[PDB]
Structures are given as structure tokens and as C-alpha cells.
Amino acid sequence: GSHSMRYFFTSVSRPGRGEPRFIAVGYVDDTQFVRFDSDAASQRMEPRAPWIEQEGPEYWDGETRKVKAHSQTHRVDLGTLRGYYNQSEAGSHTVQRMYGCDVGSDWRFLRGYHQYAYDGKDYIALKEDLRSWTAADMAAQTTKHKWEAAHVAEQLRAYLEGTCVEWLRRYLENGKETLQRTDAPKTHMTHHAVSDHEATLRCWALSFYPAEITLTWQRDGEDQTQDTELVETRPAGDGTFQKWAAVVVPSGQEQRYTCHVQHEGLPKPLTLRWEP
């Protein structure tokens, strides 16, 4: 299947005193592998998966240098944007950045992205061809002109199409035992009576990896989206994910209803029914 490497950065100003709170995290697919937190004691990029602990001191030194520099870019940015937006010195504000690369099943480059936000709104993002920028408003257009004059897109494009992919491939190999393993959902159904005439059937998917999953209900073999509820996929806390989908049915008609589960770890159709 397909794979991705993504980095996420959040800076939040502390206008009364000191530098922003800065939190950076990196993922391969749905696995967090590194972190930096400005409030933590180490002031180093830190490992969060066993397979990145292979990397030597050079790696940790380079990743720390880069993340610290990034934190200072956001320090300055929070000032600059305050000014672009004519905002006072009193309030806290937020800069977010995410970037990364997707690759296909052949592990070749598919697409890259680099998006930036101020106070949770779109600000500037690299277009899909990695050669120009989408600026949402006039402040961001000022940023776009700066980044065009300094040839930022060209640097980023070379990272996203090359370096990002190469490191992604290194990680998938080095962490193969987990990163290339798929964990199929563990499924079951439960039944819950509301009244004498209505029941809920809930279809459960537990302990799966990666997080991408589809749960669907049919009634007599036809798609049923009416009277359904689907919770957001959620992390279990041990690296795997969970989801359920429910349907409300007339009690006594449960056998008409089937839950269908698609996931990368399933080679074949999974269907569940309440025969119990």
C-alpha cells in the first residue's frame, strides 16, 4: 500500500514574557516517530519509535539544529503577522505548518505538500505542482512575494520529491517489522434494545493499523446510510486504531442488516451479521 512522511509544527505566542510554545512532531504513516517540545528539559529532537533509535548522533544533531531554527522562524513570524494584521501585543496567536510527501505502493513519489496557517485559518500553501503558492489574503500575498524572490518553492520541491522520499524509504525499511505490517481490524457486533420496537446494532473494528478504514451498512443487500451513526476513528494508545458504525433497526428485523469492513490488512470481503 501507500505511505507518507509528514511533519507538524505549532507555535503559540506568550505575549507577556518569553518565546513561543513550540511543538513539533513527525509521522511515518500513522506512527509518530520524533518530537520536539520547547517546554521539555532536553531541548533535543527526541525519538518516539524504536526503529528511529538506529540513527546516530549526527542525525540527532542535524534534526535538533533544524527544529530549533524552525522555532526561531516562527518566533519572528508571529511578530511579522501581528503587524500585517494590526493586532495588539496583548493576545496569544498561533502559527501552524505541515509538510510532507506521499508515495504509492511502489514507494515512488506521488505528491508533496507544504501548508501554513495563522490563527487556524489558511494563510499560504504550495500548489500541487510544487512550483507556485496559494495565498489566501493580502498579508499572505506579501509573504508569497518574499518567498518567490527568495526561490523557496524550488528548495521545497527538491526536498519533497527527493529527500523526503528517500528518508521515507529508509524508515520503512529500517522499521519494516511494524511499519510494513498491516493489522487487520478485529470485528464484532453488539445489539442494544431501546424499546420493544427499536434496537441498535453496532459494528466494531478494533486493533487495526493503518488508521484508514471503511465501515458500511447494507439492508437486504442495498447501501443504508439513513439511521446510521459512525464515530471518528480513534487511537487506542498502543499504536492501533478503533472505529464503530451503528444502525437503528425495527426489533425482530436484525437479520436484514449487514456490516461491511474494508481495510488494507483484509485481502477479502469482511461481512458481519447479527445471527446471534
Binding site: 511579522t80 501554513y116 494563510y123 518574499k146 526536498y159
Partner: peptide, 10 residues
């Protein structure tokens, strides 16, 4: 690994 050396300022 991260994009480096340092993102350009906004």
C-alpha cells in the same frame, strides 16, 4: 528527516 536548513520567514 526534516526540510532544512530553516524555513524562510513569512
Amino acid at each position: 528527516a526534516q526540510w532544512g536548513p530553516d524555513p524562510a520567514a513569512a
